[PDB]
Write a structure and sequence with these properties.
This is part of a larger assembly, with two copies of chain A, three copies of chain B, two copies of chain C and four copies of chain F. Chain A is of the alpha+beta class. Chain A is built from four helices and eight strands, in the order H-E-E-H-H-E-E-E-E-E-H-E. Chain A has a six-stranded antiparallel β-sheet. Chain C has eleven helices and no strands. By secondary structure, chain F is mainly β. Helix content of chain F is 7%, strand content 28%. Chain F contains three helices and 16 strands. The radius of gyration of chain F is 28 Å and the shape is extended. Chain F starts with 17 loop residues before the first helix and ends with a strand. The chains are: A alpha+beta, B alpha+beta, C mainly alpha, F mainly beta. Chains B and H meet through loops of B and loops of H.
Chain lengths: 153, 139, 167, 132, 69, 261, 130, 65, 153, 65, 69
């Protein structure tokens, strides 16, 4: 699948993407992968740049309103419920939401982990990294989504 | 022989949250259980008040039935009548082990022996019987 | 019980205690009657704001022997002559009876130490002994007063329903 | 019963309507619901018969109704305040769509029977009745 | 069962007359009377010897700790 | 006689029929479970539960009163979702006096609860008295958060937020300390409205300081040009104040900032 | 909501919003027809489902996690701009256009009422969706 | 308006304004006298006319004007 | 009684305490009686300093929350009622409250008078004084309290 | 409604203020930052930021004149 | 022998339960045994009289009605 392959590529190249930094709503005009210079990018723009490398384009800045009506996704689990036993049933590439108001999102990877940027709010210098799901399981919020390209347009 | 003694003990009350205001427990509140083995009832004899900022209260109870059935095991009395929604649980921390049947034949025989030996006054046994004849004192 | 009080606060945590300090305060007061609402209210406020409570904070809230652990297991029983001996130290001069201002200080100190530092303690029962002790100037006609404290301390709804059933 | 709590220490019942005297009867047809209603209270209604109770004398079997048209039900026990079982029996019957009455058991002489069947006004059910 | 044993022993300590030694044989026979088969054996650490009580002494109080083997 | 053996009730002879099945009047019940998605509850009778049918939340449930609800000419729906609480006492009125069809009329609190959530010390008196008007006329309300809102017939009006932060106003010189800023300002404990009825402080639920902001923006105006002017009055938890005016398209900004130090 | 007269004589009260086509419960005086009084106004199930943002299907109100979503005094004015309050520190108010007022204390909810760069967008708030 | 208790235990609610001389609808419990509960408060026609600023005599709510 | 004796001493020394000035929430660290220099003290701190001279300590700053839960007082008359005939039944030393929100307090003295500080809000220079109760009877608020030391601790 | 002005009950000018403060935050240090937006009856405006423990203040004051 | 995901509700209050489902179908539901099955069982029983044999252990383990394989 496209999403799984992209997630595996990101995991393989995760250590080499230290140039990408964390910011609240970073929306740079330069592709992080096509430049060695450091650049501040958030999770939504990171996903947009990751999916723009292939033929898919999506849209910019790809805020929370993108998922509501664009039809690019179909929900797997709804918000409001939180089960720790069903986490194993998920697959790589699924988008994981965080925060009570959709403050941040993430990409699921195997072995009970997820890829996202975490740090202090006022433009932290910490680069992208991978964190265990146990400590962040509290703020998972239960929302899960998945991609689909074959039927769209 | 003297009659039996009603069983009595202590019952603990657990509330969901500490009481914001003083509450009055109506007199004659009935404490029972749900197990089929111990359907015997209990009732309070004196008034009690639940002061605010108190998450628990303990009140003495007495067994209406005169018998050994009141010596229930731990965690038997788990029901209260006329209880408000503030009550979260009802439980007795310790078994009663105080209720008794009628006076035993051996004890009555021994006390009669003490009385017969105590007919001759001005002796140790006479003073012993004179001290022991009161129901309240023992040993 | 400084260690137990601090341990209880650490068990719930600052985040949980911060939500409902007034009612979580009642939990500590209910467990230990030694602390009133005001005493337990102030210590929790200091705990959350500062993040920790030290011995200086505990003694400031109320005077207690924090550096005393022997009382946890066993302590003196105050058997007879112990009460007579300790009361002699508190009332060493006759002007205490005449001067009521220092008398209030002296009796409060005796009651504070008597109830906390011994197995048996009481306020009203001890106060009765002090009142008799003060009135007799510490020389009552009999020694029972010293031991008096020790021995003292170790429907219409139903009727209508019943008669209605009878009829 | 107004003033019974029936609590337990740090223990609770997962299904609601427990601790109180609430009882719920469920079934997809009258014969399923009626069997639960009668079976709930019949055996405990003891008497001083030298030989048994009402269950032996009353068959209350061979019951049927419109199973296909009737969905799953959640008829409550306390639908009628301090009412008799006959009052609660009427709600389960859902008259006039079903007929209920007491009559002698022709198939088993010497004892009574409780009948609960769909109304005989249907063509085939009308033919089913014995002719006299 | 531990709480029941503790309560039974504490009740046995109470309702005891004055001027009698702390006999252990009666204690073990009383606690074993609850169930001969279920309860196998009882042993004690320090109070194996009987404690002689004076005329004015009564054995009522006492803390019981159960150490199941 | 033989024919008299039928359904009957009461000391006086009465023919029991379908009329007795109908419930005459209103009854009380307690809220046991709430369907948050539809905001329709199921109420428990002392030994029965109304509703709770096979349908989860939507097909069958007990409605709840609403302050107001409707639809605009454009078509968009508007209304209110008043707070729902478990364990509260609610009055119920059956439709056509037919059981198994409840509707909640209103919610009524216990006497102790009402006594706790009022600050009026007067035991009684006519409302027309001027002195009683000071205390009787008080629209005292508490949000689900322990921070409350207060209004009164007099000029006093107090509002609270997270922590000890609050907003207040008054005109009388006697009530001047209630909304003063001398030295360090009035303490939250000084206000009499910050105490429950039974001599207990109204603790805020959240003690962490809030951060306020007044973001202003639009789309267009009568001139027809697009609206691109953004201004804010952000306040941080640490006490900083920032008043700014922005024009995002032209990439220009002017900010008046205050630091915590 | 409330109505009365002051000691001076001036009348005070409220005029709650009235809507055409809404369902209203009626109680006749003395059970006598031709004398209606409206008790309250009740909305349709679809309308209630549309004007709430709680995703939970159910659960006891006493649960701490459910208290975050269940305790929400969510109200919408006749104007489509709404007002929002919650048991937590979050509290959102809206005005004409995309202008809004918000406040919060938790660091997790910091983006809801932040002013970094251009500030939080109106779409970012979860309470701004039906 | 609403009343309840939080998980911590603190009680919350509202105290809507009460006025003397106002007309209140009452519904007896179980249609049994000597058990009143106030359902709502309704004002007089003159009072309602005084506390509104709408000059329109009537018209459908769906009209834009 | 302790309170009555303290009130009588304050009344006797009232003329000599002109050094003490009035302020809204004056909480100085220096005892007014142990220094000739003028100092700004409010009624609550004045009462605290008066009762600190003896063995009793109380607490600081002794705001309105002190009376709620400390147990040092028992109410004589509750708030919300105002009777002018029962004023004579009061005794010297009783604490008299003022204001609709407990803005200020006072100490009762015989002959229908009370001791308190009155002046304009922004740090008036007027010293402590005694005023008739007739003009201030309107803002009495009905709340009255009394002290008790024998049973406390 | 009946062509009559809505007189305010109290004609004296009010005095507003927006006092902001807390106890602690995620960093764990105590909160000691106090700020106000006091407005006097005479028309004065005072926006201030305070730190009581450190004994520091910065005020932006406007007089009625 | 209902299909998969047939049980949906507990038919009670279900205050703390959202939904109930079964991940596997029911196959143990069977009608009365036919003549051939009884004949095979009896032949196994006859051959199972000699214990300490695999064919005997087959009948010994198969004597429980629930066991099929």
């Amino acid at each position: 699948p496209l999403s799984t392959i992209l997630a595996l590529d990101l995991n393989d190249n995760l250590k080499s993407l230290s140039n990408i930094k964390y910011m609240f709503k970073g929306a740079p005009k330069e592709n992080p992968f096509g430049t060695d210079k450091d650049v501040y990018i958030d999770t939504y723009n990171l996903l947009y740049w990751l999916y723009l490398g292939e033929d898919e384009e999506l849209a910019y800045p790809m805020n929370i309103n993108y998922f509501f009506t664009e039809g690019r996704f179909f929900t797997i689990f709804g918000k409001g419920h939180k089960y720790k036993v069903d986490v194993s049933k998920f697959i790589v590439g699924d988008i994981l939401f965080f925060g009570r108001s959709d403050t941040n999102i993430g990409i699921y990877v195997g072995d009970g982990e997820f890829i996202s940027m975490m740090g202090k709010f006022p433009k932290d210098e910490t680069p992208i990294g991978k964190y265990k799901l146990d400590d962040y399981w509290n703020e998972f919020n239960g929302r899960v989504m998945r991609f689909d390209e074959e039927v769209y347009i | 022989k003297r009659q039996s003694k009603r069983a009595y003990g202590d019952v603990t009350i657990q509330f969901y949250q500490p009481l914001d205001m003083r509450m009055y427990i109506p007199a004659g509140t009935t404490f029972t259980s749900t197990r089929q083995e111990y359907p015997q009832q209990f009732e309070t004899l004196v008034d009690y008040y639940a002061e605010p900022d108190s998450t628990e209260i303990v009140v003495e109870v007495y067994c209406k039935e005169t018998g050994v059935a009141g010596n229930v095991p731990e965690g038997t009395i788990n029901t209260i009548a006329s209880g408000s929604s503030l009550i979260r649980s009802v439980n007795n921390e310790y078994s009663f082990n105080t209720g008794t049947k009628e006076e035993s034949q051996e004890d009555f025989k021994r006390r009669f022996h003490s009385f017969v030996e105590s007919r001759g006054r001005a002796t140790n046994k006479s003073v012993r019987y004179g001290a022991l004849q009161i129901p309240d004192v023992e040993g | 019980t400084y260690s137990k009080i601090m341990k209880d606060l650490s068990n719930y945590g600052r985040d949980n205690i911060s939500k409902g300090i007034d009612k979580y305060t009642s939990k500590l007061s209910s467990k230990y009657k030694n602390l009133k609402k005001a005493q337990a209210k102030k210590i929790i406020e200091k705990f959350v704001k500062e993040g920790k409570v030290t011995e200086k904070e505990y003694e400031k809230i109320t005077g207690n022997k924090v550096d005393d652990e022997l009382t946890s297991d066993n302590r003196p029983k105050l058997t007879k002559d112990k009460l007579k001996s300790i009361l002699k130290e508190k009332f060493k001069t006759q002007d205490d009876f005449n001067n009521s201002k220092k008398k209030k200080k002296a009796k409060t100190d005796a009651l504070k130490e008597l109830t906390t530092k011994y197995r048996f303690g009481n306020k009203t029962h001890a106060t009765t002994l002090l009142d008799e002790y003060i009135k007799y100037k510490g020389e009552p006609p009999n020694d029972e007063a010293f031991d008096k404290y020790l021995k003292a301390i170790e429907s219409p709804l139903v009727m209508f329903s019943r008669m209605l059933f009878n009829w | 019963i107004q003033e019974v709590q029936a609590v337990l220490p740090e223990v609770g019942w997962l299904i609601d309507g427990d601790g109180d005297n609430e009882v719920k009867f469920t079934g997809s047809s009258a014969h399923e619901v009626m069997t639960g209603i009668i079976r709930r209270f019949i055996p405990y209604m003891k008497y001083n018969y030298t030989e048994n109770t009402i269950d032996n004398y009353l068959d209350y079997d061979d019951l049927s109704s419109w199973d296909e048209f009737e969905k799953l039900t959640e008829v409550s026990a306390f639908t009628n305040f301090d009412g008799s079982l006959k009052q609660l029996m009427d709600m389960v019957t859902a008259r006039p769509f079903n007929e209920l009455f007491f009559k002698n058991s022709e198939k088993t002489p010497g004892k009574a029977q409780l009948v609960l069947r769909k109304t005989p006004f249907n063509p085939t059910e009308w033919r089913a009745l014995d002719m006299i | 069962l531990q709480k029941h044993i503790e309560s039974v022993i504490r009740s046995y300590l109470n309702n005891l007359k004055t001027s009698d030694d702390l006999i252990i044989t009666d204690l073990i026979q009383a606690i074993m009377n609850i169930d001969d088969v279920l309860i196998y054996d009882v042993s004690f650490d320090n109070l194996d010897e009987n404690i002689i009580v004076p005329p004015q002494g009564i054995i009522r109080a006492g803390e019981i700790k159960v150490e199941l083997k | 006689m033989v024919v008299r053996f039928q359904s009957s009730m009461g000391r006086s002879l009465k023919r029991v029929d379908s009329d007795d099945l109908n419930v005459k009047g209103l009854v009380l019940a307690t809220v046991s479970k709430i369907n948050y998605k539809y905001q329709s509850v199921e109420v428990k009778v002392n030994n029965l539960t109304l509703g709770s049918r096979i349908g989860d939340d939507g097909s069958l449930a007990v409605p709840y009163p609403k302050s107001f609800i409707g639809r605009t000419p454009e078509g968009s729906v508007f209304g209110t979702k008043p707070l729902i609480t478990e364990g509260s006492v609610v009055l119920i009125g059956f439709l056509n006096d037919d059981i198994n069809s409840p509707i909640i009329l209103s919610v009524y609190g216990d006497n102790e609860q009402n006594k706790m959530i009022n600050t009026n010390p007067l035991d009684g008196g006519k409302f027309d008295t001027e002195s009683v008007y000071k205390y009787s006329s008080s629209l005292y309300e508490i949000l689900p958060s322990l921070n409350y809102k207060y209004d009164d017939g007099e000029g006093t009006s107090i509002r609270t937020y997270n922590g000890k932060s609050f907003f207040s106003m008054t005109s009388g010189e006697e009530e001047k300390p209630q909304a003063t800023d001398f030295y360090t300002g009035t303490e939250y404990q000084d206000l009499f409205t910050s105490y429950y009825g039974n001599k207990t402080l109204i603790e805020p639920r959240i003690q962490k300081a809030p951060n306020m902001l007044f973001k202003h923006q639009g789309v267009f105006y009568d001139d027809g040009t697009p609206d691109n002017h953004i201004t804010t009055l952000f306040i941080s938890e640490r006490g900083d104040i920032r008043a700014s005016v922005l024009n995002t398209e032209t990439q220009k900004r002017t900010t008046q900032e205050m630091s915590s130090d």
